[PDB]
Amino acid sequence: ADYKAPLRDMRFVLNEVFEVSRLWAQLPALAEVVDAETAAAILEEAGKVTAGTIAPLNRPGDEEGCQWNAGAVSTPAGFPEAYRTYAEGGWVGVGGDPAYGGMGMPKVISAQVEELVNSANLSFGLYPGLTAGACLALNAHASDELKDKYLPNMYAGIWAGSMCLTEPHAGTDLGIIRTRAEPQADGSYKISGTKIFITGGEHDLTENIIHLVLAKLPDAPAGPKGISLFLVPKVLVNADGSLGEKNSLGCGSIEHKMGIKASATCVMNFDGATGWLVGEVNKGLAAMFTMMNYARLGVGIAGLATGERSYQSAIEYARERIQSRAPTGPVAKDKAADPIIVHPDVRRMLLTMKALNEGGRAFSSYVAMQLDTAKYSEDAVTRKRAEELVALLTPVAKAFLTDMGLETTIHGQQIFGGHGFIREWGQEQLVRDCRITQIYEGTNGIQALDLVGRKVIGSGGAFSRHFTDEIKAFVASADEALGEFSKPLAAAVENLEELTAWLLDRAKGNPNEIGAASVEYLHVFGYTAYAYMWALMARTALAKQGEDDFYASKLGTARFYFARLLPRIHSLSASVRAGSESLYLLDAEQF
Amino acid sequence: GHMADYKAPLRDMRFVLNEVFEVSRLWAQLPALAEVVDAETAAAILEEAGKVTAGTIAPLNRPGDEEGCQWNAGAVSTPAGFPEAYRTYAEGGWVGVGGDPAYGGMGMPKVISAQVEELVNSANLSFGLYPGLTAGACLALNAHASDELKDKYLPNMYAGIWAGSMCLTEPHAGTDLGIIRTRAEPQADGSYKISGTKIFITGGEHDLTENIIHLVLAKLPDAPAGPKGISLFLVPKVLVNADGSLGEKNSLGCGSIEHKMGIKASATCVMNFDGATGWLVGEVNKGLAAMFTMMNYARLGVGIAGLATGERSYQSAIEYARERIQSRAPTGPVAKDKAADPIIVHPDVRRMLLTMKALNEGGRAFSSYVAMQLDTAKYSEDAVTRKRAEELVALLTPVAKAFLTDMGLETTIHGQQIFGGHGFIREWGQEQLVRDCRITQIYEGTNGIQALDLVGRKVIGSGGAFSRHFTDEIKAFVASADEALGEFSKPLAAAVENLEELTAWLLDRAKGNPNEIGAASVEYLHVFGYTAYAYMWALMARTALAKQGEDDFYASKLGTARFYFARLLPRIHSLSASVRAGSESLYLLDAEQF
Ligand SMILES: Cc1cc2nc3c(=O)[nH]c(=O)nc-3n(C[C@H](O)[C@H](O)[C@H](O)COP(=O)(O)OP(=O)(O)OC[C@H]3O[C@@H](n4cnc5c(N)ncnc54)[C@H](O)[C@@H]3O)c2cc1C
Ligand SMILES: Cc1cc2nc3c(=O)[nH]c(=O)nc-3n(C[C@H](O)[C@H](O)[C@H](O)COP(=O)(O)OP(=O)(O)OC[C@H]3O[C@@H](n4cnc5c(N)ncnc54)[C@H](O)[C@@H]3O)c2cc1C
């Protein structure tokens, strides 16, 4: 199965359900840069480049992997050429600041482009995602000199970015980093230390790589309040903008990984490398606050993108592979067996993927819409509500879309039976690739702890009530037909509210309760949020039913979600309600 | 990084067999076993199996994955060290540990050979599958081959000097063996000539043995259409002289091997038969039925392969979780002299670890319970006892296959996720175990086909009588429980009630509605699985409560039981609700609307 961009579903979500073009027209910051016509032409081109240049390199990229030769890292055959086309097309800076040569597309558009590229070839997609991420942090916190020297080449994709955070002993716990930044009389800093697991730390796609390095000044306090952020170029830039002296840094090695094998994962060594402070001393983590809001959604989209790619392979296979006969009797009388889509269990797996992919795509767009409101709204109370929904929902997007993407890729493989275990079919690679999204931009367990700890307990539940108030107003608006979906949605919202109240009470004076609830609570939240997404899509499909087979497909998928997936909330809620006690009965030596 | 050293779980294996199931009291009143096995005999075999699996097989797992098998002009080579390690294994008697002593097998009951299978499969799944094939092939030949074929082939196969293979699958025929096309031409000398292509043949060709004895499904020229025309043939790689020495190379070969997700050291062969000489096993047109006993044992075996990956993943994860320091316990810093606390202090890490621990220990107990039913079915002098054991084998083997492998996958995912980013790196061995575990969910058939067998044949097919045999035993256990055991027996009874109601719902709903059976199948099998594990956990709890004292093993077991009941058993409700939705939501769309 060739990758085909899901542009019809993407139009349905953005233009028919959320009607985002209505919102742009009101915001003169976006009215200048995008309209329905512009957005449509951007998606058609993105679909063309992703299917035509990027998707064909996915399988051979996994089979070849990256190579390390005396410090130089090479990507698989055709990756540098495909990157050059991508970058020349403007795709690295599509959501970039126009003040420095970016296209200025809102996140609802750049997030769809992200899905297309990551579906086509996740290894390829992560490369420009780094650069776009690094730009967010430099735009928000770097000095005018740094922004003017580095942003234009990064938005053009001529220079790549990297995030150099993780050390051998420090991933989640960045407060204990050892990398040091020594202040120089000339205003610069010399960075010394070792970073690991650095995606795109070194490669052959760009003439330069602009590293954002977490380090501590020698007099820094211990823990996270001692952390600073530095811009450290691979190649120092001469006064006239030409490339100058190679910086005192290098890639010592690349990792042997489960998946995204075409993604160079670098041990980066810094030996008094010259760099410049981004933001303020001791406020390195705050310098990444915006970057990480956008990255949490972007990682969710990466997980979803692998699920979408697996479904495209699985449905084509389920229509072509013949095996056994339908339980109600032979369907394909002209043949020796029936297409496997006739079998109940095959339909169960396919529909689980379809409902999770389409629900995840809707939720990704909803979250992108909150980021765009937070950024672009002229109303301060509107911006602030959007900021609170970003803070609540980005961890959910990160952990839930990646956990559902993994289940989706596993169904996609299992549909093929034994053939799914063979690499030439591509399904096994998507499982391996999808596993990276559950630890990329930190572990999902840390995302779920942020949700329950800071976003739920930390706001007294107020942030959640902003979300569930919007859902309840939706329910109150529902006509009789939409009641099929609004009624179970309301019951799901009540279940989540009671579980929230249980947790606020149980967590008082019992810190272990927070982590104990975290992951399963985040799942209850996720299935509740997808019920809201599915009810919103059911409302539009009910209105347009009979106008196009697309709407009948949407409603059948919705009905599967509510019938077989939404009931997942009950077991998860009961497990959460068991509390932390059974996690702590045993001492570490008793395991 | 490094895959943690494998250590056989002999203490847990003793608790399950000797303490919970009391297997020596059962072997006492079984004359055919009194002769060959007792507690001390069994303990000495387990100690020996633990040494060879940890010492010579486990160290080859990672390098075996990294090298994989090679194909050179039809010769298949296993990774470096596999032939030498196989020679050691075979010379130790491990290939024939469960085989018939009449042809030189050790004759161990399934409760013991199932434990040896767990050890080798945990150490190196690719390795463990090779002797698995031979043992399975022996079961079929012993059950159905003529005296002449048994006498000529079984001794070398039990000794592991000659390997076996199962040559069933064709490009167009996997689940549906009924449409196979491989042809068997009768010869005047009493032999047949086999022509056809088989694919996905594990150990079809390799460098571990001087001969491979293929069990090939094929059809005579005048055979009926469909599965009723299918016969089974013994087709050796190399024809054997009267004196048992190797004669002429048979007219067959390996055209290629597969590129796979996992078990990369397991040669997966396209096998071409070009008028290859072989001999009929059992009866013309009863080739599928000649594998019935072999497939009952293989289904438990594949369950055990999934559990093995999970046990290996836990050994690596618990060592890592005690050594890796990151962040501080929620209730306040624990390692005051260090920069961070061991990650085992974190609620989410404990949840993942305890999920693996409870699924591994529950699964181990369930695998021993099923093995016990296979042994009772084979060895009991009492026809009532034998018949009931056969009925539970029929019911529980599909649950063993699909549940232990599905829970194995979840277990290996947790084991990788515990490491965070480190878990994605091949040197730690956690990502391989996920890839190896995925094979078990499609080995000896897809899990969805096992689930369909359970609900279609074993539940609907028996009007629920097989299930009521199982649940009768559970309720008698519940009725017997004292006050302390009530902690576990009370929620067990509620789980049994839930399962019985779901069974009654399904028997009614399936009437005239064939889609309902497949619609319910996988999730119903999971409800059954968690109910069965609740039974296993209550049995282990009863023994631990009785022995709770100076041996801390019993405290660990009860804490694990308590996690199973608090956090995993509740999974039955959502699965029961999903099943009760029925097939309707699955058939709202036409194929074109997907
Ligand atoms: C392929 C790859 C690409 C990556 N790319 C980059 C990148 O470009 N740049 C970069 O800087 N990083 C990168 N990372 C690092 C990535 O974000 C890691 O997931 C992160 O460092 C955490 O994993 P770790 O192995 O360091 O685990 P640790 O942080 O040591 O975590 C170990 C375990 O402890 C748990 N844990 C730790 N602290 C807590 C706590 N407080 N509460 C609860 N549980 C806790 C974790 O969830 C996990 O289960 C990459 C990782 C990989 C594998
Ligand atoms: C690594 C590996 C090793 C193998 N080794 C051997 C071996 O040594 N010997 C051997 O003989 N075989 C072997 N096989 C083949 C294997 O045992 C099964 O034949 C295979 O797993 C079935 O998958 P398939 O691709 O043939 O799927 P199909 O049978 O084509 O099924 C495709 C899909 O349709 C579903 N389906 C099909 N029929 C039905 C039905 N009636 N009801 C519901 N769902 C249905 C399946 O569950 C699956 O999801 C091996 C396979 C692999 C991957």
Residue numbers in the entry:
A (entry chain A): 2 to 592
B (entry chain B): -1 to 592
Give the published text.
In the light of the structural data, we predicted that mutating the FadE2 substrate tunnel to make it more “FadE1-like” by introducing the substitutions M130G, E296A, and Q303A, might lead to activity against C16-CoA. The Gln303→Ala substitution was introduced because in the FadE2 crystal structure the Gln303 side chain points towards the substrate binding tunnel. By introducing a shorter side chain (Ala), we hoped to offset any potential physical blockage in the tunnel arising from Gln303. Consistent with this, when we solved the X-ray structure of the FadE2M130G E296A Q303A protein, the mutations had indeed opened up the substrate-binding tunnel. Furthermore, comparison of the distances between Cα atoms of residues 130 and 303 in wild-type FadE2 and in the FadE2M130G E296A Q303A triple mutant over a 1 μs trajectory using molecular dynamics (MD) confirmed that the substrate binding tunnel was nearly 3 Å wider in the triple mutant. To directly test whether these mutations could change the substrate specificity of the enzyme, we next measured the activity of the wild-type FadE2 enzyme and of the FadE2M130G E296A Q303A triple mutant against C16-CoA and C8-CoA substrates. However, the FadE2M130G E296A Q303A mutant displayed low but non-negligible activity against this substrate. We conclude that by removing the “plug” in the substrate binding tunnel of FadE2, the enzyme can be engineered to accept long-chain acyl-CoA substrates. Opening up the substrate-binding tunnel in FadE2 (by substituting Met130, Glu296 and Gln303 with smaller side chains) enabled the FadE2M130G E296A Q303A mutant to utilize long chain fatty acyl-CoA substrate. In the case of the FadE2M130G E296A Q303A mutant, this is not surprising since the “blocked end” of the substrate-binding tunnel (after the original Met130/Glu296/Gln303 constriction) will presumably have been under no evolutionary selection pressure to remain accessible to a long chain substrate.
